[PDB]
Design a protein around this ligand. Structure first.
Ligand SMILES: [Cl-]
Ligand SMILES: [Cl-]
Ligand SMILES: [Cl-]
Lengths: 110, 105, 106
């Protein structure tokens, strides 16, 4: 059985400097119903150039599941509370999903 | 590119591995990357939870999404599993050809 | 309206090669940043048998315009004969960060 509804689901990558902040950010977004769930990937290394030098720092990655309709409200909350001056908040589109899960995300969020 | 990347969550390493090997063996995907030690945060009956999970990243073709979804729903211990796919917009040609030659049609 | 930023998954056999690949791409300005996930298991079929090997995953952030050049660099330096270089679309992001990626790449 083919899914018979469209997907309005997005998957947002948000980075954080440590597990403590990743978790407090994820619990806030869930509690305030700005997302349905978050998966936190530990122990990630971040490589980037700053003032001409290559850096290698540790980070934690959040994968946040929500609806396209909530992106802007979620983005504003994250930028309000994030310890970084310029955090990484980037959405990808869920093109296919199991129909029951698409419905669950839509019923769970605001 | 007709390639998709599917995120599937599992409650432990044993089930993550048996799911991944079934999908690979039955040619419903070309490969799976298993990320260990992931934390799942979600609200249940009004309370916020923080539980362990293991994440599968499955690489396959858009044409196989539905067949793979049905197989996963058949064998997954969860009543409502998470089977969500994103589109691969670009890839190296040799890899795209390999995925297409590996999977069932 | 959707953004021009992509996120590229690239697999590598160990942490040393993941890191040298990422530093080369960052230093040569083919990407703005890379996130490296350690300790991944790779499951695949080869000659009829299912294998389970260690791998390391790079998530590379860059612009759609750079995909082909970045791809050619990765295929030049990667130890695998057939690496995995697959892009997904960033449909939107925080504006300051989308601007930063676009200003950081060459
Ligand atoms: Cl900062
Ligand atoms: Cl359940
Ligand atoms: Cl090879």
């Amino acid at each position: 059985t083919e899914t018979k509804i469209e997907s309005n689901i997005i998957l947002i990558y948000i980075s954080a400097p440590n597990q403590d902040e990743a978790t407090s950010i994820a619990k806030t977004l869930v509690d305030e119903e700005l997302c349905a769930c978050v998966s936190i990937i530990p122990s990630v290394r971040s490589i980037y150039k700053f003032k001409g030098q290559v850096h290698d720092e540790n980070e934690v990655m959040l994968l946040v599941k929500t609806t396209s309709q909530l992106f802007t409200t979620l983005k504003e909350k994250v930028t309000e509370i994030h310890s970084y001056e310029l955090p990484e908040i980037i959405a990808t589109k869920v093109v296919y999903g199991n129909e029951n899960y698409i419905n669950w995300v839509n019923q769970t969020v605001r």
